[PDB]
């Protein structure tokens, strides 16, 4: 009726939606709980309640804010200041790096941590096209960071709590930083393989439609949606016929 929403106000009011996916992560305990990105003001200290290793990478509202670590405050609680990446990303054991993306820079941190860290459970919360830049190995960027992490879109928010009229959709990508699907040696050989297999060098990588038949066999008609799993096998075959495997 008369209602009253004809002004110019906008709020995220999504403390339940985003706080939901982070509260549903449900970790084990041997997986640290890192939260990279920016500093909203409602998380991190709580994300620690899950595991026994918490540490803030941005803003100084963590550590001294954690309401007395119920863990006897004698585990991994540390506050970083300025440059980080090689300052926090540790090694050995398991971790849960759940951080969003500033939307202006991040692939760099996800690059070193995914290049030598053992996150195992990395959750990147982004809103725009970062999740698509990964599943899309047709850019060599998501593929380079895909062979080291098995991602699986799980949560998807169209920004309903983003009043009045949202614009972007923030989703949670369940990345799984594992060992490596491609031998670091044939890894550089893998990216290139993608390059030509991206633009349209299918008749160039195939000696005579032989691999083409391997594509139809893998129900991989259109690889445009392909995530990277196919390029992993398809290429693996080229690696067994040439001599780089």
UniProtKB/Swiss-Prot annotation:
Binding positions for S-adenosyl-L-methionine per the UniProt entry: 10, 12, 37, 58, 83, 100
Superkingdom to which the source organism belongs: Bacteria
A molecular function (GO) term: RNA binding
A biological process term (GO) from this entry: response to antibiotic
Name the record gives this protein: rRNA adenine N-6-methyltransferase
Record flagged with keyword Transferase: yes
Functional note: This protein produces a dimethylation of the adenine residue at position 2085 in 23S rRNA, resulting in reduced affinity between ribosomes and macrolide-lincosamide-streptogramin B antibiotics.
Encoding gene (name): erm
SUPFAM superfamilies (alphabetical): S-adenosyl-L-methionine-dependent methyltransferases
Cellular component GO terms, alphabetical: cytosol
Keyword line: Antibiotic resistance, Methyltransferase, RNA-binding, S-adenosyl-L-methionine, Transferase, Transposable element
EC code(s) of this entry: 2.1.1.184
Family: Belongs to the class I-like SAM-binding methyltransferase superfamily. rRNA adenine N(6)-methyltransferase family.
UniProt cross-references to PANTHER family, sorted A to Z: DIMETHYLADENOSINE TRANSFERASE, DIMETHYLADENOSINE TRANSFERASE-RELATED
Cross-referenced InterPro entries: KsgA/Erm, rRNA_Ade_diMease-like_C, rRNA_Ade_Mease_Trfase_CS, rRNA_Ade_methylase_Trfase_N, SAM-dependent_MTases_sf
Enzyme class, spelled out: transferase
Residues forming coiled coils: none
Alphabetized SMART domains for the sequence: rADc (SM00650)
Reactions the enzyme catalyzes: adenosine(2085) in 23S rRNA + 2 S-adenosyl-L-methionine = N(6)-dimethyladenosine(2085) in 23S rRNA + 2 S-adenosyl-L-homocysteine + 2 H(+)
């Amino acid at each position: 009726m008369n209602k009253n929403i004809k002004y110019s106000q906008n709020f995220l009011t999504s403390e339940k939606v985003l706080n939901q996916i982070i509260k549903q992560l449900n970790l084990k305990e041997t997986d640290t709980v890192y939260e990279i990105g920016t500093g909203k003001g409602h998380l991190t200290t709580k994300l620690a309640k899950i595991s026994k290793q918490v540490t803030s990478i941005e803003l100084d509202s963590h550590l001294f804010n954690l309401s007395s670590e119920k863990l006897k405050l004698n585990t991994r609680v540390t506050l970083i200041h300025q440059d980080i990446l090689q300052f926090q990303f540790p090694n050995k054991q398991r971790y849960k790096i759940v951080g969003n993306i500033p939307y202006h820079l991040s692939t760099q941190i996800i690059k070193k941590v995914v290049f030598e860290s053992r996150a195992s459970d990395i959750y990147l919360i982004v809103e725009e096209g970062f999740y698509k830049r990964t599943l899309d190995i047709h850019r060599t960027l998501g593929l380079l960071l895909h062979t080291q992490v098995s991602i699986q879109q799980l949560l998807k928010l169209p920004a309903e709590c983003f009043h009045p009229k949202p614009k972007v959709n923030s989703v949670l990508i369940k990345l799984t930083r594992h060992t490596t699907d491609v031998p670091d040696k044939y890894w550089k050989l893998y990216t290139y393989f993608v390059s030509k297999w991206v633009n349209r060098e299918y008749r160039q990588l195939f000696t005579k439609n032989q691999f083409h038949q391997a594509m139809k066999h893998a129900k991989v008609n259109n690889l445009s949606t392909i995530t990277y799993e196919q390029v992993l096998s398809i290429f693996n075959s080229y690696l067994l016929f040439n001599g780089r495997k």
